[PDB]
Structure formats: structure tokens, C-alpha cells
Motif scaffolding. Structure first.
Motif, PDB file in Angstrom:
ATOM      1  N   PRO A  14     -30.787  24.873 -38.962  1.00 42.43           N
ATOM      2  CA  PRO A  14     -31.520  25.750 -38.093  1.00 42.43           C
ATOM      3  C   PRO A  14     -31.701  25.277 -36.648  1.00 42.43           C
ATOM      4  O   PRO A  14     -31.951  24.069 -36.437  1.00 42.43           O
ATOM      5  N   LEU A  15     -31.587  26.119 -35.652  1.00 38.06           N
ATOM      6  CA  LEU A  15     -31.734  25.716 -34.293  1.00 38.06           C
ATOM      7  C   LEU A  15     -32.966  24.889 -33.974  1.00 38.06           C
ATOM      8  O   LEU A  15     -32.890  23.879 -33.209  1.00 38.06           O
ATOM      9  N   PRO A  16     -34.151  25.225 -34.487  1.00 37.94           N
ATOM     10  CA  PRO A  16     -35.288  24.411 -34.119  1.00 37.94           C
ATOM     11  C   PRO A  16     -35.156  22.970 -34.612  1.00 37.94           C
ATOM     12  O   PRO A  16     -35.732  22.072 -33.970  1.00 37.94           O
ATOM     13  N   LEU A  17     -34.485  22.787 -35.724  1.00 41.40           N
ATOM     14  CA  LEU A  17     -34.279  21.449 -36.292  1.00 41.40           C
ATOM     15  C   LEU A  17     -33.227  20.743 -35.495  1.00 41.40           C
ATOM     16  O   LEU A  17     -33.384  19.568 -35.172  1.00 41.40           O
ATOM     17  N   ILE A  18     -32.177  21.447 -35.077  1.00 44.93           N
ATOM     18  CA  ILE A  18     -31.197  20.825 -34.183  1.00 44.93           C
ATOM     19  C   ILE A  18     -31.900  20.314 -32.940  1.00 44.93           C
ATOM     20  O   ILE A  18     -31.684  19.203 -32.430  1.00 44.93           O
ATOM     21  N   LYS A  19     -32.757  21.119 -32.375  1.00 44.53           N
ATOM     22  CA  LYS A  19     -33.417  20.841 -31.132  1.00 44.53           C
ATOM     23  C   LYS A  19     -34.347  19.638 -31.284  1.00 44.53           C
ATOM     24  O   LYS A  19     -34.326  18.732 -30.477  1.00 44.53           O
ATOM     25  N   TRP A  22     -22.614  10.975 -24.050  1.00 47.77           N
ATOM     26  CA  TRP A  22     -21.420  11.707 -24.408  1.00 47.77           C
ATOM     27  C   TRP A  22     -21.369  11.901 -25.930  1.00 47.77           C
ATOM     28  O   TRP A  22     -21.212  12.997 -26.480  1.00 47.77           O
ATOM     29  N   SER A  23     -21.538  10.825 -26.694  1.00 50.19           N
ATOM     30  CA  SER A  23     -21.452  10.866 -28.122  1.00 50.19           C
ATOM     31  C   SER A  23     -22.513  11.834 -28.657  1.00 50.19           C
ATOM     32  O   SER A  23     -22.176  12.668 -29.531  1.00 50.19           O
ATOM     33  N   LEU A  24     -23.709  11.796 -28.091  1.00 45.80           N
ATOM     34  CA  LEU A  24     -24.761  12.643 -28.551  1.00 45.80           C
ATOM     35  C   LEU A  24     -24.465  14.080 -28.225  1.00 45.80           C
ATOM     36  O   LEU A  24     -24.763  14.979 -29.018  1.00 45.80           O
ATOM     37  N   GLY A  25     -23.823  14.352 -27.105  1.00 46.33           N
ATOM     38  CA  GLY A  25     -23.405  15.707 -26.789  1.00 46.33           C
ATOM     39  C   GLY A  25     -22.414  16.262 -27.813  1.00 46.33           C
ATOM     40  O   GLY A  25     -22.525  17.381 -28.314  1.00 46.33           O
ATOM     41  N   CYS A  26     -21.509  15.422 -28.225  1.00 42.81           N
ATOM     42  CA  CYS A  26     -20.527  15.837 -29.222  1.00 42.81           C
ATOM     43  C   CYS A  26     -21.164  16.108 -30.544  1.00 42.81           C
ATOM     44  O   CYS A  26     -20.802  17.072 -31.258  1.00 42.81           O
ATOM     45  N   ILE A  27     -22.173  15.329 -30.892  1.00 41.70           N
ATOM     46  CA  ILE A  27     -22.906  15.529 -32.102  1.00 41.70           C
ATOM     47  C   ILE A  27     -23.762  16.802 -32.032  1.00 41.70           C
ATOM     48  O   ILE A  27     -23.796  17.546 -33.013  1.00 41.70           O
ATOM     49  N   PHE A  28     -24.401  17.049 -30.913  1.00 42.50           N
ATOM     50  CA  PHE A  28     -25.173  18.275 -30.674  1.00 42.50           C
ATOM     51  C   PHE A  28     -24.292  19.486 -30.937  1.00 42.50           C
ATOM     52  O   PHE A  28     -24.612  20.372 -31.725  1.00 42.50           O
ATOM     53  N   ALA A  29     -23.113  19.484 -30.378  1.00 44.82           N
ATOM     54  CA  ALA A  29     -22.198  20.606 -30.494  1.00 44.82           C
ATOM     55  C   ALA A  29     -21.792  20.801 -31.947  1.00 44.82           C
ATOM     56  O   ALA A  29     -21.643  21.949 -32.472  1.00 44.82           O
ATOM     57  N   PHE A  54     -18.190  27.096 -21.864  1.00 40.96           N
ATOM     58  CA  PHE A  54     -19.036  26.704 -23.016  1.00 40.96           C
ATOM     59  C   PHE A  54     -19.500  27.799 -23.904  1.00 40.96           C
ATOM     60  O   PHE A  54     -19.787  27.582 -25.101  1.00 40.96           O
ATOM     61  N   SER A  55     -19.556  29.039 -23.372  1.00 41.31           N
ATOM     62  CA  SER A  55     -19.865  30.123 -24.222  1.00 41.31           C
ATOM     63  C   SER A  55     -18.865  30.249 -25.349  1.00 41.31           C
ATOM     64  O   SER A  55     -19.229  30.730 -26.397  1.00 41.31           O
ATOM     65  N   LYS A  56     -17.623  29.786 -25.157  1.00 35.14           N
ATOM     66  CA  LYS A  56     -16.654  29.785 -26.233  1.00 35.14           C
ATOM     67  C   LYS A  56     -16.741  28.599 -27.137  1.00 35.14           C
ATOM     68  O   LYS A  56     -16.380  28.698 -28.268  1.00 35.14           O
ATOM     69  N   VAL A  57     -17.183  27.512 -26.579  1.00 37.18           N
ATOM     70  CA  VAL A  57     -17.114  26.197 -27.235  1.00 37.18           C
ATOM     71  C   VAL A  57     -18.232  26.077 -28.248  1.00 37.18           C
ATOM     72  O   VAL A  57     -18.025  25.716 -29.404  1.00 37.18           O
ATOM     73  N   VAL A  58     -19.429  26.432 -27.840  1.00 34.68           N
ATOM     74  CA  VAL A  58     -20.547  26.329 -28.724  1.00 34.68           C
ATOM     75  C   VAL A  58     -21.392  27.576 -28.950  1.00 34.68           C
ATOM     76  O   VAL A  58     -22.565  27.517 -29.030  1.00 34.68           O
ATOM     77  N   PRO A  59     -20.792  28.720 -29.269  1.00 35.26           N
ATOM     78  CA  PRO A  59     -21.657  29.809 -29.699  1.00 35.26           C
ATOM     79  C   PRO A  59     -22.375  29.421 -31.034  1.00 35.26           C
ATOM     80  O   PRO A  59     -21.730  28.758 -31.893  1.00 35.26           O
ATOM     81  N   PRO A  60     -23.636  29.812 -31.260  1.00 33.69           N
ATOM     82  CA  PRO A  60     -24.475  30.723 -30.471  1.00 33.69           C
ATOM     83  C   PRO A  60     -25.580  29.989 -29.692  1.00 33.69           C
ATOM     84  O   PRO A  60     -26.737  30.427 -29.593  1.00 33.69           O
ATOM     85  N   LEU A  61     -25.233  28.885 -29.073  1.00 35.40           N
ATOM     86  CA  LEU A  61     -26.160  28.165 -28.351  1.00 35.40           C
ATOM     87  C   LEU A  61     -26.588  28.969 -27.101  1.00 35.40           C
ATOM     88  O   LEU A  61     -25.734  29.550 -26.449  1.00 35.40           O
ATOM     89  N   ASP A 114     -39.695  24.450 -25.693  1.00 35.64           N
ATOM     90  CA  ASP A 114     -40.300  24.915 -26.926  1.00 35.64           C
ATOM     91  C   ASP A 114     -39.983  24.067 -28.105  1.00 35.64           C
ATOM     92  O   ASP A 114     -40.022  24.546 -29.239  1.00 35.64           O
ATOM     93  N   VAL A 115     -39.680  22.792 -27.854  1.00 37.13           N
ATOM     94  CA  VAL A 115     -39.364  21.965 -28.967  1.00 37.13           C
ATOM     95  C   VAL A 115     -40.539  21.744 -29.894  1.00 37.13           C
ATOM     96  O   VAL A 115     -41.700  21.671 -29.474  1.00 37.13           O
ATOM     97  N   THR A 116     -40.209  21.691 -31.163  1.00 37.04           N
ATOM     98  CA  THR A 116     -41.155  21.540 -32.289  1.00 37.04           C
ATOM     99  C   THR A 116     -40.602  20.469 -33.187  1.00 37.04           C
ATOM    100  O   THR A 116     -39.511  19.960 -32.943  1.00 37.04           O
ATOM    101  N   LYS A 117     -41.289  20.178 -34.264  1.00 37.85           N
ATOM    102  CA  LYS A 117     -40.835  19.179 -35.177  1.00 37.85           C
ATOM    103  C   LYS A 117     -40.881  19.826 -36.567  1.00 37.85           C
ATOM    104  O   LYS A 117     -41.817  19.580 -37.348  1.00 37.85           O
ATOM    105  N   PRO A 118     -39.857  20.637 -36.888  1.00 37.63           N
ATOM    106  CA  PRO A 118     -39.792  21.211 -38.226  1.00 37.63           C
ATOM    107  C   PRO A 118     -39.490  20.198 -39.279  1.00 37.63           C
ATOM    108  O   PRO A 118     -38.964  19.114 -38.972  1.00 37.63           O
ATOM    109  N   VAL A 119     -39.785  20.560 -40.537  1.00 38.12           N
ATOM    110  CA  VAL A 119     -39.544  19.725 -41.747  1.00 38.12           C
ATOM    111  C   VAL A 119     -38.239  20.243 -42.383  1.00 38.12           C
ATOM    112  O   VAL A 119     -38.192  21.423 -42.812  1.00 38.12           O
ATOM    113  N   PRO A 120     -37.214  19.398 -42.506  1.00 44.21           N
ATOM    114  CA  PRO A 120     -35.920  19.834 -43.059  1.00 44.21           C
ATOM    115  C   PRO A 120     -35.987  20.046 -44.563  1.00 44.21           C
ATOM    116  O   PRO A 120     -36.622  19.268 -45.272  1.00 44.21           O
ATOM    117  N   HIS A 121     -35.371  21.144 -44.990  1.00 43.64           N
ATOM    118  CA  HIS A 121     -35.055  21.423 -46.379  1.00 43.64           C
ATOM    119  C   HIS A 121     -34.186  20.275 -46.904  1.00 43.64           C
ATOM    120  O   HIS A 121     -33.040  20.118 -46.489  1.00 43.64           O
TER     121      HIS A 121
END
Ligand SMILES: CC[C@H](Nc1nc(NCc2cccnc2)c2ncn(C(C)C)c2n1)[C@@H](C)O
Length: 292
Positions: free
Chosen positions: A94-99, A181-188, A242-249, A282-289
């Protein structure tokens, strides 16, 4: 080996780059730890990492040199992001967990970078997660101490997928930007559920970067044409949106990612600057499933 009498090996966690990793219980205190055993300057510098403490850095509890082995005793975490990503393949994380994860990892980097410590080999396999929603950086400081080998101790290929272009191009001096850089690749990869640049050789890695981000030139990266491994014969690819690279960010996410993947390490966003980015408003700290 004698050292191992201090611990009950509970299970093999895995094979790291440098050595085998075990979940262990300290036979006396009953503390559950992860034990990395590496078969053999590095002792001094790794020992200094015991003071490099932060909530988003896996705690290094002890560094023991004994009988041609180096044992590193760490805090134990129950899951790694690579396995979490694979488990999340149908649905996506989920996006909030990614964030939240990205925000936390940037905090860890900001901390380590403030102390002039780089990681240099960030990848999902060394990003560890707990049930409370935390993520932490593992193996910080080991690549400086040992190098990053082509194959691991078990001959596995060390992944190139997260490696910054300055390293691929042969730059001698790594800056803290390699970790961004590495973290950007992981984010994507979290966002899209596929690795961003899954190279299977140094040239494939470099070409995959270039196909997405454009072949770098002096415009975008002063001095790139003088790097040790730069070849004028590299194909000239156009940069993709980037709109092509990482949708739906969203726009804020794509902006930040773009800044984390700038070619020029001097231009690439710092961890501290990233933490201030509007993406995190709007970052939060969700609990992962999770299931353990
Ligand atoms: C094998 C490669 C290493 N992985 C790794 N995973 C850890 N837990 C995740 C896990 C646990 C059980 C089963 N499946 C995954 C861990 N908890 C502390 N540590 C120290 C050693 C950092 C852990 N290390 C690292 C090198 O990626």
C-alpha cells in the motif's frame, strides 16, 4: 567453532554477501539475535559501527574476531523487504506503507550520512522490517570494511540492480549519494512491483539506466565523459518520462524519485533534504499485514 557455544542456532536465515546468517539464542541471556559469520583495518572500522545507533539502523550488538572468523551479532528482525515485496506481488504494498518505509529509510540514511558513514550496497535483501511498521537498514558499513565482491561467499551473483551509475562508471570515491540512488531504485520497485533496472551485467545495468534516464552527458553530469569506464561509443538513448516509469506514483513522489535518481551525485537529493520533501507532508506509520 568455540564462539558458537555461546548460542543455540535456531535457524539459518540466509546467505549474506560475506557470510552465513543465523537466528540464534544467546545460551546464557536467552537474547534472540542474528549472527553473521564471516570466514576470513576491517575490525577497527566495523567495531566503530557499534556506536552508530539509530532506530532505523539494525543494531550492531557485538563484533567478535576469533579463530579466522569474524562474527557480527545483530538485533534480529523477522522479515526482509525482498520477501515482503514478493509476498505482496498480487496486491502491491500500500502507498502509505511505501511512504512510511521510504521516510524511515531516509531517516536512517540521514543519520549515518551525518556521521560520514555510507552503506554502498543497499538492496531489498538488507532492508529489514518488524511487525510495528519499522524498517531498518542492515549491513551498514560492511562494504567499506570488505569491499563489494562480484560474487558472494557462496558464489551467488551480487546484484547490480541498485548500483549507482558513478560506481558502474568506475568512480574511485563513493559519496553518500550512492545510497540515495539505491533507495530511489528500491522506492520505484515498491511502487511498480518490478525492479527498475534489473541488469544482468555491468553493461546491461548501465544500459538499462540509460534507456530510462537517458544516456548521461556533460549537460546533466559534469565530468561524466572523463570517468574511467565511460565510453564515447555508448548508445545515446532519450530520457523517459517518470509518469511512464513509475505509475501510479503521484506528482510529489515522482518529483522526489527524480531527485533521488539524478545522475550527478553532487545534484542528487540528500537524505536530510528528502525528509523535508512535500511527498512526506502526509506521512503516517501504518502497521503492515504480516504473518511470522
Ligand atoms: C541473509 C542476508 C541478511 N538477512 C538478514 N535477515 C534478517 N531477518 C529477515 C529474515 C528472518 C528470518 C527469515 N527470513 C528473513 C536479519 N535480522 C538480522 N540480520 C542481521 C544479520 C543484519 C538479518 N539479516 C542481510 C545481509 O541482508
Amino acid at each position: 567453532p568455540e564462539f558458537m557455544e555461546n548460542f543455540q542456532k535456531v535457524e539459518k536465515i540466509g546467505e549474506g554477501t560475506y557470510g552465513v546468517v543465523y537466528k540464534a539464542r544467546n545460551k546464557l541471556t536467552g537474547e534472540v539475535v542474528a549472527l553473521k559469520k564471516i570466514r576470513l583495518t576491517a575490525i577497527r572500522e566495523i567495531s566503530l559501527l557499534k556506536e552508530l545507533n539509530h532506530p532505523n539502523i539494525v543494531k550492531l550488538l557485538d563484533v567478535i574476531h576469533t579463530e579466522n572468523k569474524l562474527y557480527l551479532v545483530f538485533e534480529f528482525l523477522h522479515q526482509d523487504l525482498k520477501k515482503f515485496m514478493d509476498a505482496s506481488a498480487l496486491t502491491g504494498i500500500p502507498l502509505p506503507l511505501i511512504k512510511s518505509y521510504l521516510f524511515q529509510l531516509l531517516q536512517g540514511l540521514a543519520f549515518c550520512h551525518s556521521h560520514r558513514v555510507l552503506h554502498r550496497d543497499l538492496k531489498p535483501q538488507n532492508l529489514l522490517i518488524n511487525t510495528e511498521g519499522a524498517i531498518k537498514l542492515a549491513d551498514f558499513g560492511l562494504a567499506r570494511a570488505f569491499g563489494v565482491p562480484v560474487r558472494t561467499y557462496t558464489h551467488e551473483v551480487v546484484t547490480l540492480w541498485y548500483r549507482a551509475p558513478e560506481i558502474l562508471l568506475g568512480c574511485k570515491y563513493y559519496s553518500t549519494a550512492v545510497d540515495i540512488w539505491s533507495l530511489g531504485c528500491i522506492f520505484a520497485e515498491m511502487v511498480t512491483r518490478r525492479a527498475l533496472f534489473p541488469g544482468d551485467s555491468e553493461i546491461d545495468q548501465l544500459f538499462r539506466i540509460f534507456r530510462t534516464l537517458g544516456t548521461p552527458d556533460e549537460v546533466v553530469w559534469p565530468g561524466v565523459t572523463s570517468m574511467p569506464d565511460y565510453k564515447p561509443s555508448f548508445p545515446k538513448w532519450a530520457r523517459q518520462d517518470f509518469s511512464k516509469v513509475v505509475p501510479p506514483l503521484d506528482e510529489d513522489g515522482r518529483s522526489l524519485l527524480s531527485q533521488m535518481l539524478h545522475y550527478d551525485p553532487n545534484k542528487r537529493i540528500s537524505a536530510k533534504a528528502a525528509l523535508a520533501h512535500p511527498f512526506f507532508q502526509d506521512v503516517t506509520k501504518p502497521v503492515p499485514h504480516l504473518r511470522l
